[PDB]
Amino acid sequence: GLPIGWWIERPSGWYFPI
C-alpha cells in the first residue's frame, strides 16, 4: 500500500511488518 513499511504489497506499494 505504501512504499514505506517492511516489504512489497500485493496490489501496489509496500506494507508494514505488523
Give every CB contact of residue 9 below 8 A, 6+ residues apart in sequence: 1, 2, 15
Measure the CA angle with vertex 16, ends 3 and 18; round to 5°: 175
Q: In the 8-state DSSP scheme, what is residue 3?
A: S
- Cell numbers linked to 3: 512504499
Q: Is the dihedral of CA 4, 6, 18, 11 positive or negative?
A: positive
